[PDB]
Structures are given as structure tokens and as C-alpha cells.
């Protein structure tokens, strides 16, 4: 969990956005301006990322629930696979507004969702109508899109790992209102004050995003190793 200071360099973590869209608070992690862009300071970046990795690893050891948030369509797909690979659930694209807090109300939603899935191999064959059938399928699809990937949890998650943060400013606000710790791949235009582990990367290109996902994924497997057995053969 100590990704070479050079691997990210080729990944694209160094290229931010332009000044026209630059959070002035991010100054501590600046290196200059290539073609008037803003090149993140990787040397400043890297200790924080590896530190959060260790933090998230001790979490998974205490068996604290982790979570990830979907972003752009490419990001969402990538997030899903990494999550499913291990555990720690996953959001998809919308975050279903006030999921945290209205977690009891969305819990009833999850209940209804699972029942429908169960009754999707039951109610479908019997009493099927050219009208009701379409109703069932369509509603399930919508519910699944976002609610799917969280339905498993059956409770309040103990951590969150979003991407970019700015695109999900809503998610950080709710997480701050409960104590649930978070991690965010802040970019040159993202308010990081609410984050407890500022990862100054770049939510772009996916390539680099896949690096961050792969990284954390590995740390939570170390947590599972403490939850299963040590390396041997």
C-alpha cells in the first residue's frame, strides 16, 4: 500500500483542472501551472494517501463497515467491481438523496425491494397480467440501480470512501452530521474541510481512479486477512 511516487505520475494524477474552476483552499497541494492548469504536488499527495490506506486497514480489522460512492458512469462501474471483489458495499450514481438519516425510511425501502426480488420468481408466474408484469420489472430496475449495492448492509455503515467529493458535497454533509469518518479524492475544485483524510488526487481519466480503487481494495483485504488468517502455505 505504498504506490510508487512514479506510477501515479504516468497515471495522470498530476493534471488538475484550470484556474477558472479551482478551489482556492487547495493551495497547500500545488506545484505550478502547466498550460495554465494546476499540477497537484505529488510529494505532498503521497504520504496522505498511504496514511489513509493504513487508517482504512485498521478499520477493516475492527470490522467497521466501509462504503464507496458512484460518480461518472465509468467511475461507477469501476467502484462496483472493486467493492464486490471484497465487500464494503457500494453506491452507484445518485446517492438516493438523504440516505443517511432517512436510513430508517430507506430501510423500509430496502425491505420492499428484497421482497419484490423474492416475489420476482414467485408473483411473476402466477396472476401475471400484461400490465402488472411491466410494473414489477420497471420498478425493480429503478430501485436496484441505486439502492442495489447497499441493500446488503442491514445497518449503519461505519466509514465512507467517496471520489472527487465536490460532485457529492451532499454526501459529506450528512456524514459530518453523524461522526461517520470519510475519505475523498479531492481535486483542485473540491472543498476538503469536511473530509477527515484528504486524498489530493484527480477524479479523472479513470485510469488514475482505478489506481485509488485498487489501492484501498488491497488494504481492506488485509483487514479480512486479520479477520481470516495470516499469510502462509
Amino acid at each position: 500500500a505504498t504506490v510508487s511516487m512514479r506510477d501515479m505520475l504516468k497515471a495522470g494524477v498530476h493534471f488538475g483542472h484550470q484556474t477558472r474552476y479551482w478551489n482556492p483552499k487547495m493551495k497547500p497541494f500545488i506545484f505550478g501551472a502547466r498550460n495554465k492548469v494546476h499540477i497537484i504536488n505529488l510529494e505532498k499527495t503521497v504520504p496522505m494517501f498511504n496514511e489513509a490506506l493504513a487508517e482504512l486497514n485498521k478499520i477493516a480489522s475492527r470490522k467497521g463497515k466501509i462504503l464507496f460512492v458512484g460518480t461518472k458512469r465509468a467511475a461507477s462501474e469501476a467502484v462496483k467491481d472493486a467493492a464486490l471483489s471484497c465487500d464494503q458495499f457500494f453506491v452507484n450514481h445518485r446517492w438516493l438523496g438523504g440516505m443517511l438519516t432517512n436510513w430508517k425510511t430507506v430501510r423500509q425501502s430496502i425491505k420492499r425491494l428484497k421482497d419484490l426480488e423474492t416475489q420476482s420468481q414467485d408473483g411473476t408466474f402466477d396472476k401475471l397480467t400484461k400490465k402488472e408484469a411491466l410494473m414489477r420489472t420497471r420498478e425493480l430496475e429503478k430501485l436496484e440501480n441505486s439502492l442495489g449495492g447497499i441493500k446488503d448492509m442491514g445497518g449503519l455503515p461505519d466509514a465512507l470512501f467517496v471520489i472527487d467529493a465536490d460532485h457529492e458535497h451532499i454526501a459529506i454533509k450528512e456524514a459530518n452530521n453523524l461522526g461517520i469518518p470519510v475519505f475523498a479524492i479531492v481535486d483542485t475544485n473540491s472543498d476538503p474541510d469536511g473530509v477527515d483524510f484528504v486524498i489530493p488526487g484527480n477524479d479523472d481519466a479513470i485510469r488514475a481512479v482505478t489506481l485509488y480503487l485498487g489501492a484501498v481494495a488491497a488494504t481492506v483485504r488485509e483487514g479480512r486477512s486479520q479477520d481470516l488468517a495470516s499469510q502462509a502455505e
Binding site: 511516487m5 512514479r6 505520475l9 498530476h14 506545484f31 502547466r34 499540477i39 504536488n41 505529488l42 510529494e43
Partner: peptide
């Protein structure tokens, strides 16, 4: 490790 400036150059 090589300096960031030289690497970016």
C-alpha cells in the same frame, strides 16, 4: 527518487 521538477520536465 528523482526530483518532481526534472520528472515533469
Amino acid at each position: 527518487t528523482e526530483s518532481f521538477a526534472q520528472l515533469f520536465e
